[PDB]
Design a protein around this ligand. Structure first.
Ligand code: NA
Ligand code: NA
Ligand code: NA
Ligand code: NA
Lengths: 409, 204
């Protein structure tokens, strides 16, 4: 507990940019794109106000659009006078992917009719389309193969405080070991994480900070309308914060919270607010109505584990169950606890042979061990219970591919 | 129940079945079969024939049956085992786990075939476990899969009885003969014997 993330002061003008959404849609062969930017303002509405969204590729401005506030008519009461949508045409856009993280710079200028700037906001823009078609997750029209890993925000000395060096070190090791995707298990990450993934090139599953594993049954709270408000804020405030990051390609409703009506409601909310990204959630069986992707945890390759209510079918069998057509990507597999990862090759042989088996995220990246010092002042790695904490689950917090100090296992 | 149509020796295999000039001849082999056996309860599936590639004539006749007798699914393996002329994925000798990616008409592992993007039909091999001579090795692998996968609903072993014929030596003793033993040539020798039982019905 504590104030484990950055604290700051931000000064904004009275009349300000209060929000902005960036979208990029393409034609069949991606030879042409349209960048759509919705901008919102707060303050006094005036006819002299303008918004200019300019797109940059290096020091070269590739496109630009300017318009006064006032959206298109929406209903019988008109439209949003405090909003404006700019649309920029972009020929032969350089596409973003974990392979080639091509990025453009979008600058959002709030200004007067004749050019006096009030303020400016901006973000890195990655032109890429994420969609599920005919049972396959496609990135820029091509079926992905997720070489992912789950990554908690952990530091052996600082605990859950994240720093740029550590994040950079993780990303480099991940890419150096052929990983192209990461899952924010199990909560929105430090804001810099997304910026780094955007620039270095990693596919990201952004996940709401919602987990009620300890409840009995697991969906006791998530199926209770009384907890819908708390849950909705963890999902909606996450989308509102990271929706412009190209690295984020999939939204997750959380983890191990069973399947409740609240998940269905929030799933639809995201689908309505951001159609650009698939939504997944493993709770309640990994293939409920609250997930666009069959995302099981530790389902085996050939062996079924027919648990009642929430069976973990062999992944090859799961794909062809009568009526099923969705892609399958394990949100967790190959539990790397201690001397492990036996059978890892079986998963990859299947991923490569079956089109709809599009990978998964290994559990997990780094051991959650903490440094303690002996009577002689020498450091050692500690786990559950080493701090007097009880009840505790011992070494179960160490399931990583690398030691807490990032030394590889 | 299968129509008497097989043009295996043609090059390509669908040369006749894609030719409207042969549609009348083919249609009679299909329509007259249906008109004759449509009241038999044992017949649960209609087949357009075998090894004749996939021609437009098949599509026309597939629809004719669907229109005339909706009570029975229609299957046909030609042209890839999963064409628009079959209600069932009915491959011949597709293996359980191993793919055989032949160009145009690949034989995918049956387990992989079921979940190819957009595929939803049931799979029943119209021919598998070729029982020629000392064979049927790996038969158990097919059944483990049939039982584990709901949409893998079985298959038809190839085949029931050896097509051997009887000849006699100088003493009148009978012996089993196969291709070429009657001076017939060209011939494919013993390839006519692929059964689970000998011609006299003695079990292999
Ligand atoms: Na695959
Ligand atoms: Na753990
Ligand atoms: Na079956
Ligand atoms: Na034969």
């Amino acid at each position: 507990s504590g104030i484990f993330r950055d604290v700051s002061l931000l000064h904004k003008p009275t009349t300000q940019i209060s929000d902005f959404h960036v979208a990029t849609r393409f034609n069949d062969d991606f030879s042409r794109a349209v960048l759509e930017a919705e901008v919102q303002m707060c303050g006094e509405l005036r006819d002299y106000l303008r918004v200019t969204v300019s797109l940059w590729q290096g020091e070269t401005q590739v496109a630009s659009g300017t318009a006064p506030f006032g959206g298109e008519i929406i209903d019988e009461r008109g439209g949003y006078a405090d909003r404006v949508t700019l649309r920029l045409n972009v020929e032969n856009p350089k596409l973003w992917s974990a392979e080639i993280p091509n990025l453009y710079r979008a600058v959002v200028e709030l200004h007067t009719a004749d050019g006096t700037l009030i303020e400016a906001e901006a973000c890195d823009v990655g032109f890429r389309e994420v969609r599920i078609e005919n049972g396959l997750l496609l990135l820029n029209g091509k079926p992905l193969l997720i070489r992912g890993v789950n990554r908690h925000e952990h530091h052996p000395l600082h605990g859950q405080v994240m720093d740029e060096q550590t994040m950079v070190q993780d990303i480099l090791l991940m890419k150096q070991n052929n990983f192209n995707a990461v899952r924010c298990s199990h909560y929105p990450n430090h804001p810099l994480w997304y910026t780094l993934c955007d620039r270095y090139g990693l596919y990201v599953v952004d996940e709401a900070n919602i987990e009620t594993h300890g409840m009995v049954p697991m969906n006791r709270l998530t199926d209770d309308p009384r907890w819908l408000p708390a849950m909705s804020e963890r999902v909606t405030r996450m989308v509102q914060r990271d929706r412009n990051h190209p690295s984020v390609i999939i939204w997750s409703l959380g983890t191990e919270s069973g399947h409740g009506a609240n998940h269905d409601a929030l799933y639809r909310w995201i689908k309505s607010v951001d159609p650009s990204r698939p939504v997944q959630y493993e709770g309640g069986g990994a293939d409920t109505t609250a997930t666009d992707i069959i995302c099981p945890m530790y389902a085996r390759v050939d062996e079924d584990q027919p648990f009642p209510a929430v069976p973990k079918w062999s992944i090859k069998k799961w794909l062809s169950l009568p009526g099923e057509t969705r892609p399958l990507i394990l949100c967790e597999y190959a539990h790397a606890m201690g001397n492990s990862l036996g059978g890892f090759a079986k998963y990859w042989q299947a991923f490569r042979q079956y089109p709809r088996l599009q990978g998964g995220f290994v559990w997990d990246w780094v051991d959650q061990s903490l440094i303690k010092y002996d009577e002689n002042g020498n450091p050692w790695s500690a786990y559950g219970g080493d701090f007097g904490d009880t009840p505790n689950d011992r070494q179960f917090c160490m399931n990583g591919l690398v030691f807490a100090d990032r030394t590889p296992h």
